[PDB]
Amino acid sequence: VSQVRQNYHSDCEAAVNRMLNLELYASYTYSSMYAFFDRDDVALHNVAEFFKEHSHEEREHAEKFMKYQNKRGGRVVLQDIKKPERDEWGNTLEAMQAALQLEKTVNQALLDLHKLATDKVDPHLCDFLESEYLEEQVKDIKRIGDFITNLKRLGLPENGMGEYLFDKHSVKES
Amino acid sequence: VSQVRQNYHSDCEAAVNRMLNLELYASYTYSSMYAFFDRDDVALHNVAEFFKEHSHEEREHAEKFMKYQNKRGGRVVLQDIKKPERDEWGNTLEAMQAALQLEKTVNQALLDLHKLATDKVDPHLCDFLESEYLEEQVKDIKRIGDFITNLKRLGLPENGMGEYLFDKHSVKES
Amino acid sequence: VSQVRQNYHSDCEAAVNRMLNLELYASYTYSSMYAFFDRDDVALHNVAEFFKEHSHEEREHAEKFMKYQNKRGGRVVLQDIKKPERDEWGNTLEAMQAALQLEKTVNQALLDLHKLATDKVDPHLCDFLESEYLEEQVKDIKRIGDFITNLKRLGLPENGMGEYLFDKHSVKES
Amino acid sequence: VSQVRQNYHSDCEAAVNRMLNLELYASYTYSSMYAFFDRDDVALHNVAEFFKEHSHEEREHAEKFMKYQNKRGGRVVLQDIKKPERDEWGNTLEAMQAALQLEKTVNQALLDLHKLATDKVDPHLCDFLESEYLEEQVKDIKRIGDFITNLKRLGLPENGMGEYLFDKHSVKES
Ligand SMILES: [Cl-]
Ligand SMILES: [Cl-]
Ligand SMILES: [Cl-]
Ligand SMILES: [Cl-]
Ligand SMILES: [Cl-]
Ligand SMILES: [Cl-]
Ligand SMILES: [Cl-]
Ligand SMILES: [Cl-]
Ligand SMILES: [Cl-]
Ligand SMILES: [Cl-]
Ligand SMILES: [Cl-]
Ligand SMILES: [Cl-]
Ligand SMILES: [Cl-]
Ligand SMILES: [Cl-]
Ligand SMILES: [Cl-]
Ligand SMILES: [Cl-]
Ligand SMILES: [Cl-]
Ligand SMILES: [Cl-]
Ligand SMILES: [Cl-]
Ligand SMILES: [Cl-]
Ligand SMILES: [Cl-]
Ligand SMILES: [Cl-]
Ligand SMILES: [Cl-]
Ligand SMILES: [Cl-]
Ligand SMILES: [Cl-]
Ligand SMILES: [Cl-]
Ligand SMILES: [Cl-]
Ligand SMILES: [Cl-]
Ligand SMILES: [Cl-]
Ligand SMILES: [Cl-]
Ligand SMILES: [Cl-]
Ligand SMILES: [Cl-]
Ligand SMILES: [Cl-]
Ligand SMILES: [Cl-]
Ligand SMILES: [Cl-]
Ligand SMILES: [Cl-]
Ligand SMILES: [Cl-]
Ligand SMILES: [Cl-]
Ligand SMILES: [Cl-]
Ligand SMILES: [Cl-]
Ligand SMILES: [Cl-]
Ligand SMILES: [Cl-]
Ligand SMILES: [Cl-]
Ligand SMILES: [Cl-]
Ligand SMILES: [Fe+2]
Ligand SMILES: [Fe+2]
Ligand SMILES: [Fe+2]
Ligand SMILES: [Fe+2]
Ligand SMILES: [Mg+2]
Ligand SMILES: [Mg+2]
Ligand SMILES: [Mg+2]
Ligand SMILES: [Mg+2]
Ligand SMILES: [Mg+2]
Ligand SMILES: [Mg+2]
Ligand SMILES: [Mg+2]
Ligand SMILES: [Mg+2]
Ligand SMILES: [Mg+2]
Ligand SMILES: [Mg+2]
Ligand SMILES: [Mg+2]
Ligand SMILES: [Mg+2]
Ligand SMILES: [Mg+2]
Ligand SMILES: [Mg+2]
Ligand SMILES: [Mg+2]
Ligand SMILES: [Mg+2]
Ligand SMILES: [Mg+2]
Ligand SMILES: [Mg+2]
Ligand SMILES: [Mg+2]
Ligand SMILES: [Mg+2]
Ligand SMILES: [Mg+2]
Ligand SMILES: [Mg+2]
Ligand SMILES: [Mg+2]
Ligand SMILES: [Mg+2]
Ligand SMILES: [Mg+2]
Ligand SMILES: [Mg+2]
Ligand SMILES: [Mg+2]
Ligand SMILES: [Mg+2]
Ligand SMILES: [Mg+2]
Ligand SMILES: [Mg+2]
Ligand SMILES: [Mg+2]
Ligand SMILES: [Mg+2]
Ligand SMILES: [Mg+2]
Ligand SMILES: [Mg+2]
Ligand SMILES: [Mg+2]
Ligand SMILES: [Mg+2]
Ligand SMILES: [Mg+2]
Ligand SMILES: [Mg+2]
Ligand SMILES: [Mg+2]
Ligand SMILES: [Mg+2]
Ligand SMILES: [Mg+2]
Ligand SMILES: [Mg+2]
Ligand SMILES: [Mg+2]
Ligand SMILES: [Mg+2]
Ligand SMILES: [Mg+2]
Ligand SMILES: [Mg+2]
């Protein structure tokens, strides 16, 4: 037993490792979206940079789980990072829809981890999830939903001018 | 009944007073460690200053419970602060081992208080513990465990050179 | 055919995707080393930070291949990022030995890619490898070899004091 | 024989003069595009300025070949700069398509010169081409391809609003 370990259930330790993997998976998916929007036959560079930024954020969230694991006396166990579901992402609307689904998948896993931590009476883990993950998750879901609404308003997928304008006005110029 | 009191159970009020006492006890133990490492026949002054700092931190945490008690309309009730378990602390490894145990004792009392606050459906007290005590506790336990690992690596208790080097490189120069 | 594509062989495009994967694999291995040295029963934090930095560097090198692929009109194709070979890394000497091997594996793949680019008469790709990858690779191999020499000099694996001192003097304080 | 000349083949000297001429030709073509977009019945001034900038860049690249020739002990030999292929350039999409073709023609000539320098075992000339010409060429081809993709997305040639918006958002305001 680790000398630091206190009130940290084996099930929570394992679930933290699984959540770490999911954050890495999410990061990799966003990296794929970045590369897609940087293609010469896609060429929406502010959209590309948006997804690149989100890839980096998810990788930071994975690292934060590694640090958490060690702080509690658990042991990091890594698994393969599966490649993303798609090799090409269609257009800005399709990609944003996939991102919304991904963020809700990650949110569900965080909420499930919170249920487990609650079950095992681990208030430190509950607080960590609430303070470092749950609020920023709701904000990302809201932002992406807002974007989807605007992409539909702009006539995606058919309205190429609308898609061009979204890249200029909705996502930060990069 | 205090005019400010709302949703604050007598049992929680009493447990806050007990936790206050434990913080004061922890502070006093760290003060003893400070004085020990400042002895001319011990003379590890950065180690001494580390424990002096932790003594001050625990006293601040006691004061924060006093303020909390009054904010909720409870009444501070003080008891004797018992002297520390030992009069002399052996060496840096022995002291760090005792500090680890002390921090885990304090953590257990905080977790028990959180269980009580949860039982009595006091989300303010739960949040206070989570936001002001539980995370910094995990960090202190991790730091001290890391130190113990390094002290063993350095050949404590027998390796006096190792102990000298720990005082120069592991704890902040004071 | 991509409208930008010129003098870019399908074989080179595929090899760039494979090299991208290898950079991601290397990044992941370094992340594992970071997490290991951050364990409370390992606790060599400057060593941990060294490997964290190298993980970030390799991820940047992967991103640079993505950008390269798109600049030439190739298409990024991602595969699973395999988990690292080990779950625990022994000690600083064992980890550094594994890092040396990893950097030489990456170097060999870069040199093989250069051979292919030379075969296909692609001077842009040759220059990219020479200017962005090959020199920094030689420097990393030299640095890690120098470290291994010093770890052996310090009496690793048996000399715990030597290992402690390496973490204080050889790797940047983090 | 020039007193400075060493390892510089007559064929390479001649090919450098031909490449100089091609850079001047490219500059002149871009100047024609500038003047076209500045016409009162065309009036896309940011597009005009984009082409003016590229004209200046190509003239700088011609000058760099003159300097190179003299450094190696070759002799600059100038020929007529042929007028551009067209007197009018249609619209932003047509012009960008012609620019893409021009940049790929220049790239092919650079790659052919590199083949010759390789044949004649002239590493100085190979390095000069790789370090001063080949990478910036790939970048220009990628940028122009990205633009063409966006012009098609914006509904060129028929969508005049799309063309107006490209001039405001895609090319630097001048
Ligand atoms: Cl436990
Ligand atoms: Cl408990
Ligand atoms: Cl357990
Ligand atoms: Cl696991
Ligand atoms: Cl997993
Ligand atoms: Cl599987
Ligand atoms: Cl796909
Ligand atoms: Cl979807
Ligand atoms: Cl999903
Ligand atoms: Cl949050
Ligand atoms: Cl929007
Ligand atoms: Cl009450
Ligand atoms: Cl209530
Ligand atoms: Cl009550
Ligand atoms: Cl009481
Ligand atoms: Cl008490
Ligand atoms: Cl008593
Ligand atoms: Cl005693
Ligand atoms: Cl003890
Ligand atoms: Cl204790
Ligand atoms: Cl806290
Ligand atoms: Cl230490
Ligand atoms: Cl090709
Ligand atoms: Cl060619
Ligand atoms: Cl091919
Ligand atoms: Cl491939
Ligand atoms: Cl692969
Ligand atoms: Cl496999
Ligand atoms: Cl292992
Ligand atoms: Cl190895
Ligand atoms: Cl390897
Ligand atoms: Cl390099
Ligand atoms: Cl060294
Ligand atoms: Cl010569
Ligand atoms: Cl020679
Ligand atoms: Cl000759
Ligand atoms: Cl000539
Ligand atoms: Cl000519
Ligand atoms: Cl002629
Ligand atoms: Cl014409
Ligand atoms: Cl054309
Ligand atoms: Cl042409
Ligand atoms: Cl260049
Ligand atoms: Cl654009
Ligand atoms: Fe995340
Ligand atoms: Fe405390
Ligand atoms: Fe690399
Ligand atoms: Fe040029
Ligand atoms: Mg142990
Ligand atoms: Mg377990
Ligand atoms: Mg999973
Ligand atoms: Mg698979
Ligand atoms: Mg599809
Ligand atoms: Mg509950
Ligand atoms: Mg709660
Ligand atoms: Mg909270
Ligand atoms: Mg919050
Ligand atoms: Mg966020
Ligand atoms: Mg998110
Ligand atoms: Mg998130
Ligand atoms: Mg908003
Ligand atoms: Mg009253
Ligand atoms: Mg009472
Ligand atoms: Mg007590
Ligand atoms: Mg007594
Ligand atoms: Mg004793
Ligand atoms: Mg907190
Ligand atoms: Mg603390
Ligand atoms: Mg503490
Ligand atoms: Mg504490
Ligand atoms: Mg630390
Ligand atoms: Mg096409
Ligand atoms: Mg192919
Ligand atoms: Mg591979
Ligand atoms: Mg496997
Ligand atoms: Mg092993
Ligand atoms: Mg270099
Ligand atoms: Mg490097
Ligand atoms: Mg390297
Ligand atoms: Mg490298
Ligand atoms: Mg060096
Ligand atoms: Mg002469
Ligand atoms: Mg001649
Ligand atoms: Mg010519
Ligand atoms: Mg003529
Ligand atoms: Mg015409
Ligand atoms: Mg050769
Ligand atoms: Mg070469
Ligand atoms: Mg070079
Ligand atoms: Mg270069
Ligand atoms: Mg250029
Ligand atoms: Mg050019
Ligand atoms: Mg050029
Ligand atoms: Mg660009």
Coordinates of N, CA, C and O in Angstrom, one line a residue, chain A residues 38-130:
Chain A
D38 N -7.0 22.1 -41.8 CA -5.8 22.6 -42.4 C -5.5 22.1 -43.8 O -4.6 22.6 -44.4
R39 N -6.3 21.1 -44.2 CA -6.1 20.6 -45.6 C -6.3 21.7 -46.6 O -7.2 22.5 -46.5
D40 N -5.6 21.6 -47.7 CA -5.7 22.7 -48.8 C -7.1 22.7 -49.4 O -7.5 23.7 -49.9
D41 N -7.8 21.5 -49.4 CA -9.2 21.4 -50.0 C -10.3 21.6 -48.9 O -11.4 21.4 -49.2
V42 N -9.9 22.1 -47.7 CA -10.8 22.4 -46.7 C -10.5 23.9 -46.3 O -11.3 24.8 -46.5
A43 N -9.3 24.2 -45.7 CA -8.8 25.5 -45.6 C -9.7 26.5 -44.8 O -10.0 27.6 -45.3
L44 N -10.0 26.1 -43.6 CA -10.7 27.0 -42.6 C -9.8 27.0 -41.4 O -9.9 26.3 -40.5
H45 N -8.8 28.0 -41.5 CA -7.7 27.9 -40.5 C -8.1 28.4 -39.1 O -7.5 27.9 -38.2
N46 N -9.1 29.2 -38.9 CA -9.5 29.6 -37.6 C -10.3 28.4 -36.9 O -10.1 28.2 -35.7
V47 N -11.1 27.7 -37.7 CA -11.7 26.5 -37.2 C -10.6 25.5 -36.9 O -10.7 24.8 -35.8
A48 N -9.6 25.3 -37.7 CA -8.5 24.4 -37.4 C -7.8 24.7 -36.1 O -7.6 23.8 -35.2
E49 N -7.6 26.0 -35.9 CA -6.9 26.4 -34.6 C -7.8 26.2 -33.4 O -7.3 25.9 -32.3
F50 N -9.1 26.4 -33.5 CA -10.0 26.1 -32.5 C -9.9 24.7 -32.0 O -9.8 24.4 -30.8
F51 N -9.9 23.7 -33.0 CA -9.7 22.3 -32.6 C -8.4 22.0 -32.1 O -8.2 21.2 -31.2
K52 N -7.3 22.6 -32.6 CA -6.0 22.5 -32.1 C -5.9 22.9 -30.6 O -5.3 22.2 -29.8
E53 N -6.5 24.0 -30.3 CA -6.6 24.5 -28.9 C -7.3 23.5 -28.0 O -6.9 23.2 -26.9
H54 N -8.4 23.0 -28.5 CA -9.1 22.0 -27.7 C -8.4 20.7 -27.5 O -8.4 20.1 -26.4
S55 N -7.6 20.3 -28.5 CA -6.7 19.1 -28.3 C -5.8 19.3 -27.2 O -5.5 18.5 -26.4
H56 N -5.2 20.5 -27.1 CA -4.2 20.8 -26.1 C -4.8 20.9 -24.7 O -4.3 20.3 -23.7
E57 N -6.0 21.4 -24.6 CA -6.8 21.4 -23.4 C -7.1 20.0 -22.9 O -6.9 19.8 -21.7
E58 N -7.5 19.1 -23.7 CA -7.8 17.8 -23.3 C -6.5 17.0 -22.8 O -6.5 16.3 -21.9
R59 N -5.4 17.3 -23.5 CA -4.1 16.7 -23.1 C -3.7 17.2 -21.7 O -3.3 16.5 -20.8
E60 N -4.0 18.5 -21.4 CA -3.7 19.1 -20.1 C -4.6 18.4 -19.1 O -4.2 18.1 -17.9
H61 N -5.9 18.1 -19.4 CA -6.8 17.5 -18.5 C -6.4 16.0 -18.2 O -6.5 15.5 -17.1
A62 N -5.8 15.3 -19.2 CA -5.2 14.0 -18.9 C -4.0 14.1 -18.0 O -3.9 13.3 -17.0
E63 N -3.2 15.1 -18.2 CA -2.0 15.2 -17.3 C -2.5 15.5 -15.8 O -1.8 15.1 -14.9
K64 N -3.5 16.3 -15.7 CA -4.1 16.6 -14.4 C -4.6 15.3 -13.7 O -4.4 15.2 -12.4
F65 N -5.2 14.4 -14.4 CA -5.5 13.1 -13.8 C -4.3 12.3 -13.4 O -4.3 11.5 -12.4
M66 N -3.2 12.3 -14.2 CA -2.0 11.6 -13.8 C -1.5 12.2 -12.4 O -1.1 11.4 -11.5
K67 N -1.4 13.5 -12.3 CA -1.0 14.1 -11.1 C -1.9 13.8 -9.9 O -1.4 13.5 -8.8
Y68 N -3.2 13.7 -10.2 CA -4.2 13.4 -9.2 C -3.9 12.0 -8.6 O -3.9 11.7 -7.4
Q69 N -3.8 11.0 -9.6 CA -3.6 9.7 -9.3 C -2.4 9.5 -8.3 O -2.5 8.9 -7.2
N70 N -1.3 10.2 -8.6 CA -0.1 10.1 -7.8 C -0.3 10.8 -6.4 O 0.2 10.3 -5.4
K71 N -1.0 11.9 -6.4 CA -1.3 12.6 -5.1 C -2.0 11.7 -4.2 O -1.7 11.8 -3.0
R72 N -2.9 10.9 -4.7 CA -3.7 10.0 -3.8 C -3.1 8.7 -3.5 O -3.5 8.0 -2.6
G73 N -1.9 8.4 -4.1 CA -1.2 7.1 -3.9 C -1.7 6.0 -4.9 O -1.3 4.9 -4.7
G74 N -2.5 6.3 -5.8 CA -2.8 5.4 -6.9 C -1.7 5.3 -7.9 O -0.7 6.1 -7.8
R75 N -1.8 4.4 -8.8 CA -0.8 4.2 -9.8 C -1.4 4.3 -11.2 O -2.3 3.7 -11.6
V76 N -0.7 5.2 -12.0 CA -1.1 5.4 -13.3 C -0.8 4.2 -14.1 O 0.2 3.5 -14.1
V77 N -1.9 3.7 -14.9 CA -1.8 2.6 -15.8 C -2.3 3.1 -17.1 O -3.5 3.5 -17.2
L78 N -1.5 3.1 -18.1 CA -1.8 3.6 -19.5 C -2.3 2.4 -20.4 O -1.8 1.3 -20.3
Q79 N -3.2 2.8 -21.3 CA -3.6 1.9 -22.3 C -3.5 2.6 -23.7 O -3.2 3.8 -23.8
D80 N -3.6 1.8 -24.8 CA -3.5 2.4 -26.1 C -4.5 3.6 -26.2 O -5.6 3.5 -25.6
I81 N -4.1 4.6 -27.0 CA -5.0 5.7 -27.3 C -5.6 5.4 -28.7 O -4.9 5.4 -29.7
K82 N -6.9 5.0 -28.7 CA -7.5 4.6 -30.0 C -7.6 5.8 -30.9 O -7.8 7.0 -30.5
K83 N -7.4 5.5 -32.2 CA -7.5 6.5 -33.2 C -8.9 7.0 -33.3 O -9.9 6.4 -32.9
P84 N -9.1 8.3 -33.8 CA -10.5 8.8 -33.9 C -11.4 8.0 -34.8 O -11.0 7.3 -35.6
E85 N -12.7 8.2 -34.6 CA -13.8 7.5 -35.3 C -13.8 7.7 -36.8 O -14.1 6.8 -37.5
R86 N -13.4 8.9 -37.2 CA -13.4 9.3 -38.6 C -12.0 9.7 -39.0 O -11.2 10.2 -38.2
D87 N -11.7 9.6 -40.3 CA -10.5 10.1 -40.9 C -10.7 11.5 -41.5 O -9.7 12.2 -41.7
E88 N -11.9 11.8 -41.9 CA -12.3 13.1 -42.4 C -13.6 13.5 -41.8 O -14.4 12.7 -41.4
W89 N -13.8 14.8 -41.6 CA -14.8 15.4 -40.8 C -15.9 16.2 -41.5 O -16.7 16.8 -40.8
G90 N -15.9 16.1 -42.8 CA -17.0 16.7 -43.6 C -16.9 18.2 -43.8 O -16.6 18.6 -44.9
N91 N -17.3 18.9 -42.8 CA -17.3 20.3 -42.9 C -17.5 20.8 -41.4 O -17.5 20.0 -40.5
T92 N -17.5 22.2 -41.3 CA -17.6 22.7 -39.9 C -18.8 22.3 -39.1 O -18.6 22.0 -37.9
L93 N -19.9 22.1 -39.7 CA -21.1 21.7 -39.0 C -20.9 20.2 -38.5 O -21.2 19.9 -37.3
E94 N -20.6 19.3 -39.4 CA -20.4 17.9 -39.0 C -19.3 17.8 -37.9 O -19.5 17.0 -37.0
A95 N -18.2 18.5 -38.0 CA -17.2 18.5 -37.0 C -17.7 19.0 -35.7 O -17.4 18.4 -34.6
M96 N -18.4 20.1 -35.7 CA -19.0 20.6 -34.4 C -20.0 19.7 -33.8 O -20.0 19.6 -32.6
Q97 N -20.8 19.0 -34.6 CA -21.7 18.0 -34.1 C -21.0 16.9 -33.4 O -21.4 16.4 -32.4
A98 N -19.9 16.4 -34.1 CA -19.1 15.4 -33.5 C -18.4 15.8 -32.2 O -18.3 15.1 -31.2
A99 N -18.0 17.1 -32.1 CA -17.4 17.7 -30.9 C -18.4 17.8 -29.8 O -18.1 17.5 -28.6
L100 N -19.6 18.2 -30.1 CA -20.6 18.2 -29.1 C -20.8 16.8 -28.5 O -20.9 16.7 -27.3
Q101 N -21.0 15.8 -29.3 CA -21.1 14.4 -28.9 C -20.0 14.0 -28.0 O -20.2 13.3 -27.0
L102 N -18.8 14.3 -28.4 CA -17.6 14.0 -27.7 C -17.5 14.6 -26.3 O -17.3 14.0 -25.3
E103 N -17.9 15.9 -26.3 CA -17.9 16.6 -25.0 C -18.9 16.1 -24.1 O -18.7 16.0 -22.9
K104 N -20.1 15.6 -24.6 CA -21.1 15.0 -23.8 C -20.7 13.6 -23.3 O -21.0 13.2 -22.2
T105 N -20.0 12.9 -24.2 CA -19.4 11.6 -23.7 C -18.4 11.8 -22.6 O -18.5 11.0 -21.6
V106 N -17.5 12.7 -22.7 CA -16.6 13.0 -21.7 C -17.3 13.4 -20.4 O -17.0 13.0 -19.3
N107 N -18.3 14.3 -20.5 CA -19.1 14.8 -19.4 C -19.8 13.6 -18.7 O -19.8 13.5 -17.5
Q108 N -20.4 12.7 -19.5 CA -21.0 11.5 -18.9 C -20.0 10.7 -18.1 O -20.4 10.2 -17.0
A109 N -18.8 10.5 -18.6 CA -17.8 9.7 -17.9 C -17.4 10.4 -16.6 O -17.2 9.8 -15.6
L110 N -17.3 11.8 -16.6 CA -17.0 12.5 -15.4 C -18.1 12.4 -14.4 O -17.9 12.2 -13.2
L111 N -19.4 12.5 -14.8 CA -20.5 12.3 -14.0 C -20.6 10.9 -13.4 O -20.9 10.8 -12.2
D112 N -20.3 9.9 -14.2 CA -20.2 8.6 -13.7 C -19.1 8.4 -12.6 O -19.3 7.7 -11.6
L113 N -18.0 9.0 -12.9 CA -16.9 9.0 -11.9 C -17.3 9.6 -10.6 O -17.0 9.2 -9.5
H114 N -18.0 10.7 -10.7 CA -18.5 11.4 -9.5 C -19.5 10.5 -8.8 O -19.4 10.5 -7.5
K115 N -20.4 9.8 -9.5 CA -21.3 8.8 -8.8 C -20.5 7.8 -8.0 O -20.8 7.4 -6.9
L116 N -19.4 7.3 -8.6 CA -18.6 6.3 -8.0 C -17.9 6.8 -6.7 O -17.9 6.2 -5.7
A117 N -17.3 8.0 -6.9 CA -16.6 8.7 -5.8 C -17.6 9.0 -4.6 O -17.3 8.8 -3.5
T118 N -18.9 9.3 -5.0 CA -19.9 9.5 -4.0 C -20.2 8.2 -3.3 O -20.3 8.2 -2.1
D119 N -20.4 7.1 -4.1 CA -20.7 5.8 -3.5 C -19.6 5.4 -2.5 O -19.9 4.8 -1.5
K120 N -18.3 5.6 -2.9 CA -17.2 5.3 -2.0 C -16.9 6.3 -1.0 O -15.9 6.1 -0.2
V121 N -17.7 7.3 -0.9 CA -17.5 8.4 0.2 C -16.1 9.0 0.1 O -15.3 9.0 1.1
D122 N -15.8 9.5 -1.1 CA -14.5 10.2 -1.4 C -14.8 11.6 -1.7 O -14.9 12.0 -2.9
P123 N -14.9 12.5 -0.7 CA -15.2 13.9 -1.0 C -14.0 14.7 -1.7 O -14.3 15.6 -2.4
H124 N -12.8 14.2 -1.5 CA -11.7 14.9 -2.2 C -11.8 14.7 -3.7 O -11.7 15.6 -4.5
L125 N -12.1 13.5 -4.1 CA -12.3 13.2 -5.5 C -13.6 13.9 -6.1 O -13.5 14.5 -7.2
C126 N -14.6 13.9 -5.3 CA -15.8 14.6 -5.8 C -15.5 16.1 -6.0 O -15.9 16.7 -7.0
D127 N -14.8 16.7 -5.0 CA -14.5 18.1 -5.1 C -13.5 18.4 -6.3 O -13.7 19.4 -7.0
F128 N -12.6 17.5 -6.5 CA -11.7 17.6 -7.6 C -12.4 17.7 -9.0 O -12.2 18.5 -9.8
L129 N -13.4 16.8 -9.1 CA -14.2 16.7 -10.3 C -15.0 18.0 -10.5 O -15.1 18.6 -11.6
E130 N -15.7 18.4 -9.4 CA -16.5 19.6 -9.4 C -15.7 20.8 -9.7 O -16.2 21.7 -10.5

